[PDB]
Design an enzyme around this catalytic site. Structure first.
Site, PDB file in Angstrom:
ATOM      1  CG  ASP A  17      13.664  43.007 -24.765  1.00 41.78           C
ATOM      2  OD1 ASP A  17      13.117  43.290 -23.750  1.00 41.78           O
ATOM      3  OD2 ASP A  17      14.474  42.355 -25.264  1.00 41.78           O
ATOM      4  CG  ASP A  19      10.722  40.168 -20.094  1.00 42.72           C
ATOM      5  OD1 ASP A  19       9.442  40.428 -19.822  1.00 42.72           O
ATOM      6  OD2 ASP A  19      11.117  38.888 -20.213  1.00 42.72           O
TER       7      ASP A  19
HETATM    8  N1  LIG Z   1      17.488  39.450 -24.053  1.00 41.38           N
HETATM    9  C1  LIG Z   1      16.977  40.037 -22.731  1.00 41.38           C
HETATM   10  C2  LIG Z   1      15.451  40.444 -23.041  1.00 41.38           C
HETATM   11  P1  LIG Z   1      14.356  39.542 -22.381  1.00 41.38           P
HETATM   12  O1  LIG Z   1      14.541  38.993 -20.943  1.00 41.38           O
HETATM   13  O2  LIG Z   1      12.841  39.862 -22.726  1.00 41.38           O
HETATM   14  O3  LIG Z   1      14.561  38.165 -23.315  1.00 41.38           O
HETATM   15  C3  LIG Z   1      17.997  41.448 -22.318  1.00 41.38           C
HETATM   16  O4  LIG Z   1      19.276  41.325 -23.101  1.00 41.38           O
HETATM   17  O5  LIG Z   1      17.655  42.378 -21.679  1.00 41.38           O
END
Ligand SMILES: N[C@H](CP(=O)(O)O)C(=O)O
Ligand SMILES: N[C@H](CP(=O)(O)O)C(=O)O
EC number: 3.1.3.3
Lengths: 222, 222
Positions: A17, A19
């Protein structure tokens, strides 16, 4: 913990991931911050609560204004706002070293993640996010809408792609939110990660949830 | 023809199409040339005629065939293939001093058609060409599908959208293909053109079929 365990090096693939997990900053909220639409967008999030809105509309909307010029995401990259969450650069190395294909998976943008890649010395081919589009002018044109992660729950649609094709069998997903986690049923093992973000609804229902990417070094060595 | 042709001095605003009317060669075929699809693109446009399928459909294919990158389209306006026809510059330059409005309504890309508009000194806003989308990595990503010039009968849309808008008394269309001619009724009048390209369709069928601004600039320079 011994349970882990090189649990991990019994894996051929480890999808990360970006972020909030590969890095401290989110990838979208930054684009808006460099666009003078900072608190304009951060004010767009409180109501997805309801989530009505699905993921594509949601993003197609918050993005539907930022209107990130090509320029601007270029100034972003140039300023290197993305800062890795502390034991990733080395953790990815100890992996691909032992001969493991590290991957990156984001709802963010391939513009940003790619750069993030080079700094983990991660291959370019091993990255999966929304591809931002621009006009010759460099103005915001939208974005690739066929890309696995442009739809709701497509985070796993990719993790089971990487297997369909390279046939890994036994891959891990390091992620901070329930989207990363919901990808476990499609993917072998899920390691939650809160860094930066605790996100209770994963720190309660998820098996194997680390606090920081260092906690996993001592056991990794021995 | 009854000569001297109050046609032009009475005029409020005149506008021409870009591809081999104000310029020598066509942007699509020239762009396709630096992609290796020259023969293929060339043959599609030719079959596109008087009852051919719409514009929007066939130019999705051709472009899907060519697939031009921000690197290819930018370097073209290096090799600046676009060549102005003999009497285009100062014909419009002439009429532009008199306080009239001149416009470029073309089913081409402003990415290219605006380099032309420049110095004919026509504004940038006085150019109606569909745009071409591009990925951050600079690769083809479609084209703005919402533009008048992107579909069939498009030229007569911007024109009729030009009178209600700025309100003119004498809007004159000037093109080489029946397409640019299908817009006359909405516009006040039409003048053909065969300097670069011929196609009877329009040669023998309209009023004042000029061939080559040179051959109408004489009585124009009057
Ligand atoms: N899907 C996001 C991760 P991202 O924002 O990198 O796609 C989450 O549930 O924290
Ligand atoms: N539609 C084009 C005109 P343009 O290239 O200006 O769009 C033709 O008449 O063949």
């Amino acid at each position: 913990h011994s349970e882990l365990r090189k649990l991990f090096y019994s894996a051929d693939a480890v999808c990360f991931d970006v972020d909030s997990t590969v890095i401290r900053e989110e990838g979208i909220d930054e684009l808006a911050k460099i666009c003078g639409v900072e608190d304009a967008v951060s004010e767009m999030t409180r109501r997805a609560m309801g989530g009505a809105v699905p993921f594509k509309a949601a993003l197609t909307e918050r993005l539907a204004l930022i209107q990130p010029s090509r320029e601007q995401v270029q100034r972003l990259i140039a300023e290197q706002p993305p800062h890795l969450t502390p034991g990733i650069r080395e953790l990815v190395s100890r992996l691909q070293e032992r001969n493991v294909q590290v991957f990156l998976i984001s709802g963010g943008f391939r513009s940003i993640v790619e750069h993030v890649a080079s700094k983990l010395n991660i291959p370019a081919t091993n990255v999966f996010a929304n591809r931002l589009k621009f006009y010759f002018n460099g103005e915001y044109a939208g974005f690739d809408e066929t890309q696995p992660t442009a739809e709701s729950g497509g985070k796993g649609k990719v993790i089971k792609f990487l297997k369909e094709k390279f046939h890994f069998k036994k891959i891990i997903m390091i992620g901070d939110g329930a989207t990363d986690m919901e990808a476990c049923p499609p993917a072998d093992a899920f390691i939650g990660f809160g860094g930066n973000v605790i996100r209770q609804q994963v720190k309660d229902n998820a098996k194997w949830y680390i606090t920081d990417f260092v906690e996993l070094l001592g056991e990794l060595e021995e």
